[model samples]
Target: GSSGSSGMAEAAAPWYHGPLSRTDAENSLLRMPEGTFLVRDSTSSPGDYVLSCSENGKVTHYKLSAEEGKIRIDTHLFDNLDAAITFYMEHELEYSSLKQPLQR
Candidate 1:
């Protein structure tokens, strides 16, 4: 359920998709915070796509058949998906794991 529980910078806030710090994502309080999706099974995976997000309204989704490692924010590639994937791999501890990275 995509709640407007809290609004982000702006619905169309120039959508900057990149590596966000773990601390920043945790405190966002908007929709999809950064780094929250990389290690969580709690994400919403409908069909072959998994769309996980944060409270401040930041979100990312992975397509099962995606080969090129594509990341689309508002239907555009903010950065190479592989770049993001690599970042996630390196920073798994900052996100959700067996331990909670951010406090709700």
Candidate 2:
């Protein structure tokens, strides 16, 4: 008999669209209006993540840096992805604001 065992898994965040491609991200943003966004694997930087957002009428990307083990965006320290998403709802980034989330 093949017994299936469980292994440790990382935290899953709805906004975190892991392993998604940039081209696809852009396509998804086409249907969503301004302020809609999602987090996905960085195309240029492996092991890194980027926030793909529809800013104004165009899609913009922002790196979610790893700083001191916390998720850092625009140098702001976020405990996790959820916290970061929450912060952006009230705050603005470089004239851009997060009003909606592009979930999977």
Candidate 3:
């Protein structure tokens, strides 16, 4: 049975691994807007991470989880560091859930 629409599967999104080097990671952090920063999920929690952004000196933390071998924020999975950063910037709200993906 079929709905008659094309059944093509969409390509999976990209996932971000850690930066190449300490210097490179630091450089990326520096270039981010003020109050935005990245951190490892925890000392013992490898493969997990968090992106935090501050507004009005109040901080909002986005927890990125690794699932099915990919990194995700809410339900949106990213294909690269830049994509993840873009999502973080757009929905790094102090008091709300991310509701939509950015329109291309």
Candidate 4:
């Protein structure tokens, strides 16, 4: 998941057939579902849910603050759901220890 290519084809899993967004913050930890949380900079709110780790070497983690929204993930990693999963499985442990503990 080095921003190279997704092994899955477009016809195989439609869910995983898009590219990453450019407007997205870079160097951040992303979650399973899209538009969930951008973990980076000082933007993450206290107790905000962030991805800790994944099985694949795709997902990446980051340190979030809540107010600052500078993330650190492959914002341009993969736009489609398929590529996203590729990242998730690759780099999950990078950001698996950040816990803000917010009250619902």
Candidate 5:
């Protein structure tokens, strides 16, 4: 009989749902579950990072100012969960990738 498992079980990745308190050493990798969005500063754009979102089979990014006290996704404000989701659906998903990884 052949073995059922291929022995590829490894540690899963980390997912970012809510705000991850920015640390001194910033990490650029950001992940999240499908139908979700998050904002943080870790990209190359001046005073801005990636505002990413994931859909059923894809993910997206948006560039917005994450300066001292301002963060916007295409000039749209996200004050609540629904707000983020709404903005993502309308803006991000239009041009997204199909490489959404699971965050552990």
Candidate 6:
């Protein structure tokens, strides 16, 4: 277990393409799995981002809104961005979205 591995392998999700529009995101999630999802940069809101997921043979967007140092994902507002992302990965039973971590 190396504690000081600086600037190593890419930690960021390769699937995330900054400013990737909804139109492009639609084609990105190619029925790889029902739960395939991707993070995308907001078009109008510079401070916000989006969660684009594949569902029902198509893609749907979930807004990751930010406010007062907190982030909102539907009704469950997460205070920490790191926690929110990790928690979502842990599995949100309500939506059960984002099945697997994908590669670009």
Which candidate number has the best lDDT?
A: 2
Give the per-residue lDDT digits (tens) of candidate 2, residues 12-96.
Answer: 6657778899888899997898888899887887776898888878888888877767788886888877788888888886557
Q: lDDT of candidate 3?
A: 0.49
lDDT of 4 at 8: 40
Worst 10 residues of 6 by lDDT: 93-102
lDDT of 4 by residue, 1-104 (tens): 66555554334332211222322322222323222233222234443223322213234334322223332333433333334445554554344332221111
Q: Could you tell me how far off, in angstroms, the CA of residue 26 lies in candidate 3 after the best superposition?
A: 17
lDDT per residue for candidate 5 within 1-104, as digits (tens), equals: 34645464442223333333343112333344454545545446555555565655554566665544555556565554334445455554554433332343
Q: Tens digit of lDDT per residue, candidate 3, span 1-104?
A: 68744464343222222332334434554554444454444233577676544335344446667777677777789865456766655764455323322111
Cα TM-score per model? 0.23, 0.78, 0.44, 0.20, 0.37, 0.72
* Collision count for each candidate, in order: 12, 0, 2, 36, 1, 0
Residue 68, candidate 5: Cα error in Å is 7.7
Question: Candidate 4: TM-score?
Answer: 0.20
lDDT by residue for model 6 (1-65), tens: 66656656556665566778888878777656667777778877998988877777766788888
lDDT of 1 by residue, 17-94 (tens): 234443443444243344444322212332222223342244333432333555543333425534544444454422
- What clash pairs does model 2 have? none
Evaluate residue 79 in candidate 1 and report its C-alpha lDDT on the 0 to 100 scale: 50
* Residue 1 in candidate 2, Cα distance off native in Å: 19
Candidate 4, after superposition: displacement of residue 51 in Å? 9.0
Which candidate model has the greater TM-score, 3 or 5?
Answer: 3
Where does candidate 3 stray beyond 4 Å?
A: 1-35, 90-104
When 2 and 6 are scored with lDDT, the better candidate is 2
Q: Rank by lDDT, highest first.
A: 2, 6, 3, 5, 1, 4
Residue-level error in angstroms, candidate 3, position 72: 0.9
RMSD value for candidate 4: 14.8
